[PDB]
Design a protein around this ligand. Structure first.
Ligand SMILES: *[C@@H]1O[C@H](CO)[C@@H](O[C@@H]2O[C@H](CO)[C@@H](O[C@@H]3O[C@H](CO[C@H]4O[C@H](CO)[C@@H](O)[C@H](O[C@H]5O[C@H](CO)[C@@H](O)[C@H](O)[C@@H]5O[C@H]5O[C@H](CO)[C@@H](O)[C@H](O)[C@@H]5O)[C@@H]4O)[C@@H](O)[C@H](O[C@H]4O[C@H](CO)[C@@H](O)[C@H](O)[C@@H]4O[C@H]4O[C@H](CO)[C@@H](O)[C@H](O)[C@@H]4O)[C@@H]3O)[C@H](O)[C@H]2NC(C)=O)[C@H](O)[C@H]1NC(C)=O
Ligand SMILES: O=C(OCc1ccc(C(F)(F)F)cc1F)N1CCC2(CC1)CN(C(=O)[C@H]1CCc3[nH]nnc3C1)C2
Ligand SMILES: [Ca+2]
Ligand SMILES: [Ca+2]
Ligand SMILES: [Cl-]
Ligand SMILES: [K+]
Ligand code: NA
Ligand SMILES: [Zn+2]
Length: 806
């Protein structure tokens, strides 16, 4: 109940919300059915429209008007945005040449440049180029300010998860808004787009920008706008707020547009009906910039123009129906559409079985347009698993497609031509970013980046300390004319040991054998140098990784590779090696097929053993530095050391072998040398973070050899490919992956074919940022380069997407 009998007189769009049952006048009262009786009359004036006509100039103030053309309007801060253009001979902001804004040019009393976030729903990245003729204001912002060719949204590429990620710098799995629709079993409650449950604070984790601001003494405009409040009134409310007295005036503001998402659903991303929504958004940007210029704020405010996701061509006839796969279609609940999430309809049913459901969905049709996953098997780059609201079973739907439960759901719930929510690497899902203002750079293009990074920058822009988030603070310093934050490298926690030869062959009882008993101060002084690290500058190009947690590990040097060997996990944490363009691939000699050799530098007690692999009928083994790429027959023996060995399901050895025997060489050939760092990852609780030893759910049978959940590689070379990887004088280029260590290849529908038809596509699907691998390993890479740390942070957040050009 609300006693809606108070008044909005002089309270229109008040910045503090009053507690029920007093009636409200803020921009969200409509959505709470709690506005005062007179809110529409006083606060939502529409009379005369939104623009000053020539005959309205100098007029007598008529308070019924939506905006004013009278002489006092500038002092009252409530002119129509085009006032000075029509009545005072000024030009529109879009017609002025752009002039670099070296320093904030603000009125007295402004302690900091205000930030305005202009967010647009469904603004696909290519609209910048393709709609450029009809968006002059937006195009001026873009070319005069700082812009990226595109910005990557988070998965699922839906509105709430993306707006709330923009606000928090967190993955949906951490902030809790894991979709536009959700069920929470601890609450036993549901969340929908329509309805009131979404207004309960318990859904919303993290700390969004407006709360960060408030707690640190920076005042915020109120980000959310009721759907009935028209865009023009949103702009005038913002501009009015900017005219408030210093002690009352907020420093951060948000504008939101439901366009062009709304029309894009109806007409598709490039429907002819789409030109108009784009003109209209541009007109609104015009009104803001005109309004700022009136207030002499146009060289003072930082403006961010940002989308939440793009839009794809999707129709009703491109729907896959679970009813064509499942017999038990009514024992399940499906969250449907551009992604699928499945749970049991009843908790009391014990005949429900996720595993058989997945099996019924796996590679069942030739052209199948979705792929089932257990959530922990999704690509790690999606960071989509560590939340009770994310169902164990997930379907990644092909772009341009939908998944529904039964055909009745589609014709009794074609209507639409456009949708979104797909994998966040998909081109059509990419959105936009432009920063314009004194704090952003002038006429600057920056590389594409992820929307998780913006919370940090908006904190910088406002002099705020960001709450703990998933951005990498400093990775976007290159967007800014002046930086508030200058990151330092994290301190190494554990220093390595440098073991020498301490053990005799006979101390080892590992069940391993090697036909290596084939026998000169020429080649014996040589090999001593290699074991002391004479070739370490070749194979370790950016310094050793730093270990950021407490553990016990050894650096091991070899002719062809260096490793950081964990006495705790009984395998390397990382193995580093350089393969030059000229390097040659050889095969494993017949006599050395099963060869595993004790490492006389490392105790039997801190070693793996071959017997456990023999007894474990499921688990085989592989090598982190590949024997195939040994530099000489003699160096090859090094590759067979028990300390280069890691556990591998036979199904996974098919992937690994192909990567090591074929792809490393291909990359070295195409990129002019590559440095490779490979290693194991353990993430049994799927939180994206390194497991401690006590979190490991699986060992090689009868041993303390823990089984990785994933294998990673980071493949670095010179951005200038004319320079060799081992002699690069400038910026680097990187691609990485985190491959799931799975006992089958069910994920790849063509895996019965040759590795050359499916392996590389699998690797591409599991592309990763170096930063993802840091979180998962507790390591810090690129410690010693000639590059600035900010540039390295940018490099670490890079993702190689394998999509074609936008
Ligand atoms: C992306 O960035 C984020 C932000 O930095 C990273 O997430 C952080 O990771 C930390 C490590 O996992 C985690 O720290 C823990 O905090 C626990 C207290 O957390 C509460 O308070 C904070 C601060 O106000 C708040 O943010 C939290 O909010 C979460 O939970 C509520 C729901 O309850 C949601 O509203 C909200 O959305 C958020 O949910 C997310 O996080 C939780 C985990 O907290 C997930 O389970 C959800 O799925 C969701 O993703 C909380 O309100 C604290 O209790 C932990 O301490 C335990 O473990 C430490 C280890 O040092 C140990 O010393 C303690 O003894 C303690 O153990 C006890 O509990 C154990 C488990 O119950 C039990 O086994 C033991 O026996 C002990 O009794 C821990 O310090 C931090 O909370 C989150 N923050 C956020 C916002 O998510 C994230 O890692 C980054 N991702 C990547 C890939 O890098
Ligand atoms: O005011 C607002 O935005 C907040 C905001 C703005 C900016 C930043 C930040 F970037 F700064 F962080 C963070 C941030 F939470 N809201 C207005 C009301 C809704 C939520 C957003 C509810 N809604 C919808 O349900 C639309 C979904 C999709 C769609 N398409 N067509 N119709 C629709 C309906 C839009
Ligand atoms: Ca949206
Ligand atoms: Ca983990
Ligand atoms: Cl959803
Ligand atoms: K075996
Ligand atoms: Na297969
Ligand atoms: Zn939409």
């Amino acid at each position: 109940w609300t006693a809606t009998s108070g008044s909005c007189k002089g309270r229109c769009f008040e910045l503090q919300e009053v507690g029920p049952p007093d009636c409200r006048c803020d921009n969200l009262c409509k959505s709470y059915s709690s506005c005062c009786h007179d809110f529409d009359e006083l606060c939502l004036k529409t009379a005369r429209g939104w623009e000053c006509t020539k005959d309205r100039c100098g007029e007598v103030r008529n308070e019924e008007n939506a905006c004013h053309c009278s002489e006092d309007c500038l002092s009252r801060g409530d002119c129509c945005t085009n006032y000075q253009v029509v009545c005072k001979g000024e030009s529109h902001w879009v017609d002025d040449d752009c002039e670099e804004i070296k320093v904030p040019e603000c009125p007295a009393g402004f302690v900091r440049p205000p930030l305005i976030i202009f967010s647009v729903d469904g603004f696909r990245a290519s609209y910048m180029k393709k709609g450029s003729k009809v968006m002059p204001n937006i195009e001026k912002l873009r070319s005069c300010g700082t812009h990226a060719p595109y910005m990557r949204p988070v998965y699922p590429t839906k509105t709430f998860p993306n707006l709330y990620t923009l606000a928090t710098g967190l993955y949906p799995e951490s902030h809790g808004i894991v979709g536009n629709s959700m069920y929470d079993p601890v609450f036993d409650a549901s969340f929908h787009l329509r309805g009131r449950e979404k207004f309960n604070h318990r859904w919303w984790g993290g700390q969004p920008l407006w709360i960060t601001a408030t707690k640190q003494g920076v005042r915020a405009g109120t980000f959310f706008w009721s759907v009935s409040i028209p865009h023009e009134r949103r702009i005038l409310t913002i501009l009015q707020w900017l005219s408030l007295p210093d002690n009352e005036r907020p420093s951060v503001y948000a504008f939101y547009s439901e366009q062009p998402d709304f029309s894009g659903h109806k007409y598709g991303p490039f429907g002819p009906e789409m030109t108009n929504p784009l003109r209209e958004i541009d007109k609104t940007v015009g009104q803001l910039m005109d309004g700022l210029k009136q207030l002499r704020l146009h060289r003072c405010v930082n403006v961010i123009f940002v989308g939440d996701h793009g839009m794809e061509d999707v129709t009703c006839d491109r729907t896959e129906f679970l009813s064509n796969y499942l017999t038990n279609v009514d024992d399940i609940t499906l969250v449907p559409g551009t992604l699928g999430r499945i749970r049991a309809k009843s908790i009391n049913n014990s005949k429900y079985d996720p595993k058989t459901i997945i099996a019924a969905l796996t590679c069942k049709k030739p052209d199948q347009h979705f792929k089932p996953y257990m959530k922990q098997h999704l690509p790690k780059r999606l960071h989509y698993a560590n939340n009770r609201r994310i169902e164990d079973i997930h379907l990644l739907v092909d772009r341009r497609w939908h998944v529904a439960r039964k055909p009745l759901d589609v014709y009794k719930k074609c209507f639409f031509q456009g949708d979104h929510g797909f994998d966040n690497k998909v081109n059509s899902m990419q959105t936009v970013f432009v920063g314009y203002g004194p704090t952003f750079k002038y006429r600057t293009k920056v590389p594409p980046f992820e929307n998780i990074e913006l919370y940090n920058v908006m904190c910088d822009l406002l002099g705020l300390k960001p709450a703990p988030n998933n951005g990498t603070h400093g990775s976007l310093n290159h967007l800014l004319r002046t930086n508030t934050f200058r990151p330092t490298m994290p301190d190494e926690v554990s220093r390595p040991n440098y073991p020498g030869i301490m053990y005799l062959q006979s101390e080892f009882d590992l069940g391993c054998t090697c036909d290596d008993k084939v026998e000169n101060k020429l080649e014996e002084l040589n090999k001593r140098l290699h074991t002391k690290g004479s070739t370490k500058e070749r194979h370790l190009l950016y310094g050793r990784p730093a270990v950021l947690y407490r553990t016990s590990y050894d650096i091991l040097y070899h002719t062809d590779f260096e490793s950081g060997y964990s006495e705790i996990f009984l395998m390397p944490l990382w193995t580093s090696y350089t393969i030059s363009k000229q390097a040659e691939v050889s095969s494993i000699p017949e006599h050395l097929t099963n060869c595993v050799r004790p490492d006389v530098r490392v105790s039997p007690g801190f070693s793996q053993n071959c017997l456990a692999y023999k007894n474990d009928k499921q688990m085989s083994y592989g090598f982190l530095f590949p024997p195939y790429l040994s530099s000489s027959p003699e160096a090859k023996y090094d590759a067979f050391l028990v300390t280069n060995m890691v556990p591998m399901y036979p199904a996974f050895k098919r992937v690994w072998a192909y990567f090591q025997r074929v792809l490393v060489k291909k990359y070295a050939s195409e990129r002019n040398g590559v440095n490779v760092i490979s290693g194991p990852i353990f993430d049994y609780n799927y939180d994206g973070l390194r497991d401690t030893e006590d979190e490991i759910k699986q060992y090689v049978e009868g041993s303390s050899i823990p089984v990785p959940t994933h294998y990673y590689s980071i493949i670095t070379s010179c951005l200038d490919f004319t320079q060799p990887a081992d002699k690069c004088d400038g910026p680097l280029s990187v691609s990485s992956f985190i491959l799931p260590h799975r006992p089958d290849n069910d994920e790849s529908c063509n895996s019965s074919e040759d590795e050359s038809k499916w392996v590389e596509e699998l690797m591409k699907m599991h592309t990763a940022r170096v930063r993802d691998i840091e979180h998962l390993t507790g390591l810090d890479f690129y410690r010693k380069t000639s590059r600035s740390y900010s540039e390295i942070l940018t490099l670490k957040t890079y993702l190689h997407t394998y999509e074609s050009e936008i």
